[PDB]
Symmetry: C2
Subunit: 344 residues, 2 copies
């Protein structure tokens, strides 16, 4: 099992609007977007992209600005749907085949080719990629092996090498990396040790280091980071304390200070942030209230403010954001969302 | 002729350090970099990359994080030098041949291939590109025609199409764009009218629109923007007032508010900024003091603060940056820099 998942995928679009993707009771993918590129913009409301999915739907932005959404289908294949033009209309759902047993994880190679990572029936990590920048057709499926028990997460190093993170059968954090940008050549799997009870979250720091956050065996938030830009050795695990009842979400303030969000024991949203600078010590955990039934999802908007989404007790998506002094009261974006995570 | 040029090229590197490139009295390219990814970091001091150049040296970051510097040689060919590894050592200077009559202008295509633009002996716009992502070999040279009387500037649209801007023989702003990302297919040249007396500066707004700044016939700062994301029609010219005696420089605050810098009639650095938000009205012009002998060069650092470089009366490079309340007093980074601009 893993800590309670994020309920939506969010992106800050090429025209600076937040757009959220979730799963309805009907197992279709629904999306909601800001009208305007500003904190507190009015929202479209929920509209259906249809499909029938059995994973979290995961949006990624192509290097040409076109959104593309990846999800496991009811047939256990990887499916996708994409904008035919930047912030315009959508394709039909198309199958990329395979059989997958996790949420997909996506990143652009330095050459503009999306690469998708997902667990297989064998609990190994599999991958498939665009054969040309921001376009089909796609490569054959292949395996990067391992034995994983969490959803995988991918990020790019500051030298353009993709790196993937996942929990192992021993409940340690494991990782594997490209040996060169855009490559089909990967490292061996390596253990970063620890005992983790959530999906891992990966972010690039202002100084080009990967930093991974995960819930610990004690339900505290832990983190570990590359000690040199795009390189090991890693720091070894450090606790950020708290007692959290969901997966964490992490985003960068516009001054690059990291901020972590998670559900607390009182079912409120809690957060901890770097103080002073992106090199600064972490704050005490503080409450942002709400009563939430999912992990929070955090994103920086076009005004450089953090916005956080979470499911409420009514199964609506609710939203709070940074103000000059504080955070805004929770508002409802409505909808009825399910946790469709392929791993729970 | 054109307004007095920027003296350096600056980048925020893949490990969040500012690195500045200039030309010495010896016509070699010199560089200076922050030790640490923070406002007020100590600097390396000036070190030589050698070469013998007759343009502003222009640094660009490859999609794999490797810096690459482009300059016209004393032989009037395009030359370049690149990091062999991300924030590591440098190649030898290599010729990309051709004959050019402007500073080079560089952007990455969505597929990771750098494309370089420079004026020819015929005063047409010429271009050359990497044949593969972040690597040689390079394409043949070819012309995009036109007749230009300023250094060209290139930016990518929010839909991944490169667009180039330059002053025409009629002193209007002209532009030309790719018809598709990564394409060799371009539009016809189109006039945006106006009368401009500086190189144009181009920036992408938070909402995915190109906005161009240039000095006017009245030595005021003017600007014009795409009215729709990655699309015409354009806004038509609007004055931001001031009386400026250098080219302008523009950067984005970490909340995406645009800020323009230029030398004033008193030879001090002056600036004007968007107030409230990236959609907000522009401030009155205010002084940041100094006595400068170049256009300013503006960049946002890893702490989300603007830093501005300018040549002093002693021909040293000086530096001021945003503080909580104000701006820091000018400090000297030393060196002896010349304006090597291929167009003055
Ligand atoms: C990232 O996991 C950190 C874990 O490190 C382990 O070595 C500790 O025994 C354990 O403490 C209960 C932590 O959860
Ligand atoms: C973020 O959740 C907002 C919640 O606010 C709570 O105070 C309400 O009782 C409850 O009302 C349905 C909401 O779910
Ligand atoms: C994201 O919300 C989608 C839901 O919208 C609701 O308004 C519908 O009643 C419901 O259809 C049964 C959908 O699941
Ligand atoms: C961008 O140039 C704006 C120019 O627009 C011209 O139409 C004006 O006559 C002229 O006013 C003196 C401005 O410099
Ligand atoms: C940015 O320029 C700083 C200048 O400050 C001036 O106040 C000094 O007189 C002068 O001293 C050499 C410097 O060039
Ligand atoms: C960027 O500064 C480079 C200059 O460094 C100076 O210290 C040297 O005297 C001078 O060599 C004649 C260089 O041009
Ligand atoms: Cl668990
Ligand atoms: Cl002039
Ligand atoms: Na954006
Ligand atoms: Na905060
Ligand atoms: Na950077
Ligand atoms: Na300012």
């Amino acid at each position: 099992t893993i800590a309670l998942s994020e309920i939506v995928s969010v992106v800050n679009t090429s025209d600076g609007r937040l757009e959220v993707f979730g799963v309805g009771t009907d197992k279709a993918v629904w999306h909601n977007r800001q009208m305007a590129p500003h904190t507190g913009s009015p929202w479209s409301g929920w509209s259906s992209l249809k499909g029938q999915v059995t994973s979290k739907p995961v949006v990624y932005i192509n290097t040409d600005g076109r959104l593309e959404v990846f999800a496991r289908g009811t047939d256990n294949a990887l499916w996708h749907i994409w904008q035919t033009a930047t912030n315009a209309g959508w394709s039909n759902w198309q199958s990329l085949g395979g059989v997958i047993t996790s949420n997909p994880a996506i990143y652009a190679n330095t050459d503009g080719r999306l690469e998708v990572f997902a667990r297989g029936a064998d609990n190994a990590l599999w991958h498939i990629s665009q054969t040309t920048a921001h376009s089909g057709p796609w490569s054959s499926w292949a395996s990067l092996n391992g034995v994983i028990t969490s959803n995988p997460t991918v990020h790019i190093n500051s030298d353009g090498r993709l790196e993937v993170f996942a929990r192992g059968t021993d409940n340690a954090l494991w990782h594997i990396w490209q040996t060169a940008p855009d490559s089909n050549l990967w490292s061996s799997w390596e253990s970063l040790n620890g005992i983790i009870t959530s999906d891992p979250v990966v972010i690039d720091t202002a100084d080009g280091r990967l930093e991974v956050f995960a819930r610990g065996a004690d339900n505290a938030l832990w983190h570990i980071w590359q000690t040199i830009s795009h390189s090991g050795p890693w720091s070894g695990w450090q606790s950020l304390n708290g007692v959290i009842t969901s997966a964490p979400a992490v985003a960068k303030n516009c001054d690059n200070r990291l901020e972590a969000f998670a559900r607390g024991t009182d079912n409120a949203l809690w957060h901890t942030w770097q103080t002073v600078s992106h090199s600064g010590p972490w704050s005490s955990w503080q409450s942002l209230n709400g009563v939430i039934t999912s992990a929070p999802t955090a994103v920086r908007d076009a005004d450089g403010r953090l916005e956080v989404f979470a499911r409420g007790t009514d199964n609506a998506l609710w939203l709070t954001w940074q103000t000059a002094s504080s955070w805004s009261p929770w508002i409802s974006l409505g909808g009825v969302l399910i946790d469709a995570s392929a791993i729970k």
